[PDB]
Amino acid sequence: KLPPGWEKAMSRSSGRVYYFNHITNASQWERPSGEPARVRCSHLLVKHSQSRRPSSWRQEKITRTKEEALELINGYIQKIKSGEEDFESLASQFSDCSSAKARGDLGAFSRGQMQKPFEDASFALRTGEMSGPVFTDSGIHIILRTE
Ligand SMILES: OCc1ccc2nsnc2c1
Ligand SMILES: OCc1ccc2nsnc2c1
């Protein structure tokens, strides 16, 4: 009926239906449109105190909580979806991954090289699509599939 991992849902404030993808954690109002060896993604990582390495080029000692980290991710997603800010601009300034220097880009990759929730989401995104918050041992990700 619907593409991989999508379900119908109802907005709690509106009452109108919307669509949600439990693999990528994306949500939209529109019924989603319509697998390759490799995909190409960029991402924005917000680490927290339980990240595998609680440190980054932005902070020698990352001390925020997972909940605080999720709030930061949600903020960026709002600004990206509203158009006030571009994904590349926010990655470049705020991602705790060193890939921030490259506007968040990671290159292309196959299944089995990335952490699994990141890989599942990356491969479930269509080209040009953004994910919701995705959780890994590194922290909370916003993923943009570019190829
Ligand atoms: O940390 C992994 C990673 C991957 C791609 C990059 N481009 S620039 N810095 C990078 C870092
Ligand atoms: O996965 C580690 C990694 C991968 C690609 C890179 N380009 S430049 N720095 C990098 C680091």
Tab-separated table of C-alpha atoms and ligand atoms in Angstrom:
chain	number	residue	atom	x	y	z
A	1	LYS	CA	0.000	0.000	0.000
A	2	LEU	CA	2.744	2.434	1.041
A	3	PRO	CA	6.535	2.488	0.506
A	4	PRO	CA	8.948	0.724	2.917
A	5	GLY	CA	8.321	1.690	6.530
A	6	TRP	CA	5.505	4.247	6.148
A	7	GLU	CA	2.280	4.316	8.155
A	8	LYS	CA	-0.758	6.557	8.312
A	9	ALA	CA	-1.264	8.646	11.430
A	10	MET	CA	-3.383	11.467	12.787
A	11	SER	CA	-2.173	14.865	13.913
A	12	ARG	CA	-3.076	15.378	17.559
A	13	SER	CA	-3.746	19.090	17.169
A	14	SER	CA	-5.197	19.154	13.626
A	15	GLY	CA	-7.049	15.902	13.139
A	16	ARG	CA	-5.792	15.569	9.571
A	17	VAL	CA	-3.872	12.477	8.529
A	18	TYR	CA	-0.124	12.510	7.991
A	19	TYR	CA	2.556	9.966	7.204
A	20	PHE	CA	5.407	8.643	9.299
A	21	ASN	CA	8.353	6.379	8.555
A	22	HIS	CA	9.522	4.297	11.501
A	23	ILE	CA	12.870	3.521	9.815
A	24	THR	CA	13.900	7.123	9.148
A	25	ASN	CA	11.596	8.862	11.675
A	26	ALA	CA	10.436	11.251	8.966
A	27	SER	CA	6.957	12.791	8.998
A	28	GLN	CA	5.087	14.784	6.353
A	29	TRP	CA	1.533	15.681	5.378
A	30	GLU	CA	1.787	14.330	1.814
A	31	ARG	CA	1.362	10.669	0.867
A	32	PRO	CA	4.966	9.541	0.199
A	33	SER	CA	6.060	9.268	-3.426
A	34	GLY	CA	6.068	5.921	-5.234
A	35	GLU	CA	17.404	-0.883	-3.522
A	36	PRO	CA	20.736	0.475	-4.773
A	37	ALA	CA	24.155	-0.894	-3.906
A	38	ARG	CA	25.316	2.447	-2.506
A	39	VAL	CA	23.837	5.745	-1.353
A	40	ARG	CA	25.427	9.102	-0.550
A	41	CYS	CA	24.394	11.003	2.565
A	42	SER	CA	25.366	14.049	4.569
A	43	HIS	CA	24.518	14.311	8.247
A	44	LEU	CA	24.424	16.542	11.308
A	45	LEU	CA	25.397	14.840	14.579
A	46	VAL	CA	24.566	16.146	18.061
A	47	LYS	CA	26.494	14.174	20.678
A	48	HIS	CA	25.565	13.758	24.348
A	49	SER	CA	27.185	12.496	27.532
A	50	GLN	CA	26.402	8.841	26.691
A	51	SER	CA	27.913	9.076	23.171
A	52	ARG	CA	30.594	6.454	22.480
A	53	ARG	CA	33.104	9.333	22.526
A	54	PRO	CA	31.700	12.276	24.511
A	55	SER	CA	33.943	14.797	22.729
A	56	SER	CA	34.111	16.648	19.423
A	57	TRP	CA	35.856	19.486	17.555
A	58	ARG	CA	33.252	21.811	19.139
A	59	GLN	CA	33.619	20.653	22.765
A	60	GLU	CA	36.487	18.851	24.469
A	61	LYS	CA	33.958	17.446	26.990
A	62	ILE	CA	30.397	17.117	25.719
A	63	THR	CA	28.114	17.246	28.771
A	64	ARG	CA	24.592	17.633	27.411
A	65	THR	CA	22.030	14.909	28.041
A	66	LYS	CA	20.417	12.773	25.376
A	67	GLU	CA	17.199	14.693	26.010
A	68	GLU	CA	18.949	18.052	25.581
A	69	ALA	CA	20.604	16.693	22.419
A	70	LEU	CA	17.243	15.626	20.988
A	71	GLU	CA	15.858	19.111	21.637
A	72	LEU	CA	18.756	20.581	19.645
A	73	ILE	CA	18.112	18.184	16.764
A	74	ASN	CA	14.415	19.076	16.785
A	75	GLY	CA	15.302	22.763	16.647
A	76	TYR	CA	17.544	22.367	13.626
A	77	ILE	CA	14.899	20.291	11.835
A	78	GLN	CA	12.358	23.055	12.369
A	79	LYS	CA	14.698	25.670	10.934
A	80	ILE	CA	15.595	23.429	7.994
A	81	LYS	CA	11.959	22.637	7.193
A	82	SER	CA	10.906	26.274	7.554
A	83	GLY	CA	13.711	27.364	5.247
A	84	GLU	CA	15.175	29.844	7.741
A	85	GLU	CA	18.365	27.775	7.606
A	86	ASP	CA	20.001	25.356	5.208
A	87	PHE	CA	21.103	21.850	6.200
A	88	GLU	CA	24.699	22.493	5.090
A	89	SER	CA	24.869	25.727	7.081
A	90	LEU	CA	23.689	23.997	10.274
A	91	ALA	CA	25.914	20.934	9.844
A	92	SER	CA	28.924	23.203	9.199
A	93	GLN	CA	28.309	25.158	12.412
A	94	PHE	CA	26.905	22.595	14.842
A	95	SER	CA	27.585	18.969	13.882
A	96	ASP	CA	29.815	17.178	16.409
A	97	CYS	CA	31.213	15.061	13.574
A	98	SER	CA	34.410	16.224	11.894
A	99	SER	CA	32.393	15.997	8.649
A	100	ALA	CA	31.093	19.432	9.603
A	101	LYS	CA	34.014	20.911	7.647
A	102	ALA	CA	32.558	19.284	4.507
A	103	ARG	CA	28.999	20.606	5.027
A	104	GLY	CA	28.143	17.234	6.616
A	105	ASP	CA	28.965	15.062	3.597
A	106	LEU	CA	30.231	11.520	4.253
A	107	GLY	CA	30.667	10.229	0.716
A	108	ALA	CA	28.952	7.190	-0.730
A	109	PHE	CA	28.769	3.870	1.109
A	110	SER	CA	27.383	0.324	1.076
A	111	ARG	CA	25.417	-1.726	3.571
A	112	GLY	CA	27.637	-2.913	6.431
A	113	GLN	CA	30.026	0.042	6.806
A	114	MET	CA	27.885	2.390	8.942
A	115	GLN	CA	26.110	1.827	12.220
A	116	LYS	CA	22.896	-0.037	11.551
A	117	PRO	CA	20.188	2.532	12.412
A	118	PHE	CA	22.143	5.083	10.402
A	119	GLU	CA	22.413	2.582	7.537
A	120	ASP	CA	18.735	1.594	7.665
A	121	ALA	CA	17.630	5.220	7.606
A	122	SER	CA	20.130	6.245	4.891
A	123	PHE	CA	18.941	3.431	2.591
A	124	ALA	CA	15.266	4.046	3.356
A	125	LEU	CA	15.512	7.729	2.407
A	126	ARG	CA	14.715	8.645	-1.163
A	127	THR	CA	17.132	10.899	-3.016
A	128	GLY	CA	16.791	14.433	-1.706
A	129	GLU	CA	14.904	13.380	1.455
A	130	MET	CA	15.707	14.230	5.052
A	131	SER	CA	15.323	11.976	8.061
A	132	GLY	CA	13.916	12.657	11.466
A	133	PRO	CA	16.149	12.114	14.500
A	134	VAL	CA	18.148	8.901	14.133
A	135	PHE	CA	19.832	7.382	17.181
A	136	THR	CA	23.211	5.641	17.243
A	137	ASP	CA	26.024	5.006	19.678
A	138	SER	CA	27.517	8.285	18.438
A	139	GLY	CA	24.390	10.291	19.285
A	140	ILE	CA	21.475	11.830	17.390
A	141	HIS	CA	21.664	12.347	13.608
A	142	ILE	CA	19.879	14.336	10.937
A	143	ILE	CA	20.528	12.504	7.664
A	144	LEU	CA	20.209	13.912	4.149
A	145	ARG	CA	20.501	11.437	1.317
A	146	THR	CA	22.164	13.233	-1.595
A	147	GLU	CA	22.648	10.407	-4.137
B	1	LIG	O1	34.409	11.450	10.648
B	1	LIG	C1	34.245	10.817	9.389
B	1	LIG	C2	34.398	11.811	8.268
B	1	LIG	C3	33.930	11.517	6.992
B	1	LIG	C4	34.040	12.396	5.932
B	1	LIG	C5	34.668	13.640	6.161
B	1	LIG	N1	34.883	14.619	5.257
B	1	LIG	S1	35.669	15.787	6.049
B	1	LIG	N2	35.744	15.176	7.541
B	1	LIG	C6	35.164	13.961	7.467
B	1	LIG	C7	35.025	13.032	8.521
B	2	LIG	O1	35.397	7.197	8.053
B	2	LIG	C1	36.441	8.095	8.397
B	2	LIG	C2	36.682	9.093	7.288
B	2	LIG	C3	36.186	8.860	6.009
B	2	LIG	C4	36.379	9.736	4.956
B	2	LIG	C5	37.108	10.921	5.200
B	2	LIG	N1	37.401	11.883	4.303
B	2	LIG	S1	38.380	12.912	5.076
B	2	LIG	N2	38.315	12.345	6.592
B	2	LIG	C6	37.634	11.185	6.505
B	2	LIG	C7	37.408	10.260	7.554
